[PDB]
DNA sequence: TTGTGCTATGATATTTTTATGTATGTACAACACACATCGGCGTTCCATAGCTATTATATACACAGCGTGCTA
């Protein structure tokens, strides 16, 4: 990729002595700059990684270079250990396991091997928007090489500690526009579009009188936003596309779940069951419409699904969301004529969590996304299936809020 | 004088996910007495070769049945 030599360049100026930060899409091959690097410095390289899943791949990088099983290519986990060699190495490590404190389990003077006999030269960091946190500073703290490497897909957080990243590790090399990036290839184009529904009077006045994170149990539980997510779900079922639903919050995300009768991820769910529903969605033409919660979101991103629905929200977090839609939409690669993707959130008017979801929209626009506000589609008034539109059905759904609001 | 409001810290309240020690489900073999071993056939069809009854005649000998005399 022609951004990928854009980058490789600088490090084709210099040579020795230098360090900085790469932002590079998560449908990027960031990984193939580290081992293009890795080609160029030849040393012992550590990549550190969050999850089991990109030790995978960067492993499957290393199989797509050359060899990995002679002593030489290590692989530190708390399952098993793997030898290294001097003048070349390539080991994936995690932060939780370097960083510690007392526990052990005979694991850390194997990473401690690794760190005392000096085999190293070369550092990869990925996600570097995590490191602002002080187990990251244990780990730099810990590390000292020749040349470091940061790879990460976006920086915007409200900490005011990503200035901090500029004397770590190195100040921000190369910044790629995901615009001309799109231009290059199709990774779907994003249409931000925030839904304006209206609010009921009872809601409104129960939504004054709460506050804190419970008078979100009053924001999402809104009959129109029930109305409004049928209506996109039947409308989007009616165009072909299949659908996905995120929520920060668990029991509304069970709420949709179960009135709208979809398979549903969550918080302290087996892994058979996840793996069962993650089948039927890259399977199954019957379902088309999958609600994730952070736990399905931060584990895996599926390149299918044009249509991204945005119901709950947590305060302050809008950048962490910003940049699990962007993971989904640059998940969405496949060069097509068209390609449109569309991205709802669903908000209330006079609401506390719109005035959020506007910061949100305007992490979208420093990303040079294409942002437009809809107050109501036309269609929804034909539905005769959209449940809530009944006072009965309001007043029965105000007294299971009155009780959530018992409950919590 | 006493009550009320913002800066900042202090403490208090939520959320996701890594491995870890204990629990649960499932193998394995296995220990040492409990026990074991040892000894100083019936039934039916077809080709085969022997084997059945008879006589003309002499000789001599034994065996079973019948016709006639005597007396009680």
């Given at each position: 990729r022609p951004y990928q030599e854009k980058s490789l360049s600088k490090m084709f100026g210099n040579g020795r002595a230098r360090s900085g930060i790469i932002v590079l899409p998560c449908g990027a091959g960031k990984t193939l700059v580290g081992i293009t690097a890795a080609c160029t410095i030849k040393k012992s390289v550590i990549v550190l990684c969050t999850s089991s899943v990109s030790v995978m791949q960067w492993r499957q990088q290393f199989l797509x270079x050359x060899x990995x099983x002679x002593x030489x290519x290590x692989x530190x986990x708390x399952x098993x250990x793997x030898x290294x060699x001097x003048x070349x190495x390539l080991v994936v490590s995690t932060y939780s396991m370097v960083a510690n404190x007392x526990x052990x389990x005979x694991x850390x003077x194997x990473x401690x091997x690794x760190x005392x006999x000096x085999x190293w030269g070369f550092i990869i960091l990925d996600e570097?928007?995590?490191?602002?946190?002080a187990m990251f500073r244990r780990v730099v703290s810990t590390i000292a090489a020749h040349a470091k490497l940061g790879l990460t897909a976006t920086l915007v957080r409200e900490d005011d500690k990503i200035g901090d990243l500029n004397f770590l590790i190195g100040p921000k090399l190369y910044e790629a526009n995901w615009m001309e990036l799109s231009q290059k290839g199709h990774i779907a184009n994003v249409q931000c579009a925030e839904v304006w529904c209206p609010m009921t009077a009872e809601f409104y006045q129960e939504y004054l009188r709460e506050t804190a994170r419970k008078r979100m149990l009053l924001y999402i539980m809104n009959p129109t936003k029930f109305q409004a997510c049928q209506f996109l779900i039947q409308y989007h079922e009616r165009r072909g596309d299949k659908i996905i639903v995120f929520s920060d919050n668990v029991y509304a995300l069970q709420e949709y779940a179960l009135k709208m009768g979809k398979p549903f991820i969550y918080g302290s769910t087996p892994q058979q069951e996840r793996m069962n529903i993650l089948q039927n969605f890259q399977?199954?033409?019957?379902?088309?419409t999958i609600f994730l919660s952070k736990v399905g979101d931060t584990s895996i991103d599926l390149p299918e699904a044009t249509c991204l629905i945005q119901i709950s929200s947590h305060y302050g977090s809008r950048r962490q969301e910003a940049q699990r839609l962007g993971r989904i939409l640059r998940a969405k690669?496949?060069?097509?004529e068209g390609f449109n993707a569309f991205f709802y959130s669903l908000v209330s008017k006079d609401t506390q969590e719109m005035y959020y979801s506007t910061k949100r929209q305007a992490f979208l626009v420093d990303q040079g996304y294409a942002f437009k506000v809809i107050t109501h589609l036309h269609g929804?008034?034909?539905?005769?299936?959209?449940?809530?539109?009944?006072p009965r059905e309001r007043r029965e759904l105000l007294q299971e809020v009155l009780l959530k609001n018992e409950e919590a």
């Open positions: 570097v928007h995590v490191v602002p946190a399977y199954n033409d019957q379902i088309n690669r496949r060069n097509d929804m008034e034909n539905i005769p299936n959209l449940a809530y539109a009944s």
